[PDB]
Design a protein around this ligand. Structure first.
Ligand SMILES: [Cl-]
Ligand SMILES: [Zn+2]
Ligand SMILES: [Zn+2]
Ligand SMILES: [Zn+2]
Length: 99
């Protein structure tokens, strides 16, 4: 249950994103889903925002400047948007329609 206001820090499917300013153990990091910058360690200079339900990870620079991916991949069965074909493919394997 989350619908961001236009221009708020949101994921591609308009949910509010959680800021992660600390690192858990076993943290593998990610490549920013918007700019592709590697984010291997969370610090005060380089931190992340995440939407858990979308598996959407963005660096603080892209999130706060409202940068968006210029290519969107959509699931035909539920309409959900993804930043890559690989993430759409992982979703699609287990999707037969809206949850
Ligand atoms: Cl839209
Ligand atoms: Zn980024
Ligand atoms: Zn989301
Ligand atoms: Zn789907």
């Amino acid at each position: 249950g989350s619908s961001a206001a236009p221009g708020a820090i949101q994921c591609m499917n308009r949910h509010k994103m959680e800021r992660h300013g600390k690192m858990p153990a076993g943290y593998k990091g990610f490549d920013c889903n918007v700019c592709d910058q590697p984010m291997l360690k969370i610090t005060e200079k380089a931190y992340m925002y995440r939407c858990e339900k979308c598996d959407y990870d963005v660096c603080n620079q892209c999130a706060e400047s409202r940068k968006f991916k210029e290519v969107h991949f959509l699931c035909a069965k539920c309409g959900k948007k993804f930043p890559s074909q690989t993430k759409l493919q992982y979703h699609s394997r287990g999707c037969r329609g809206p949850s």
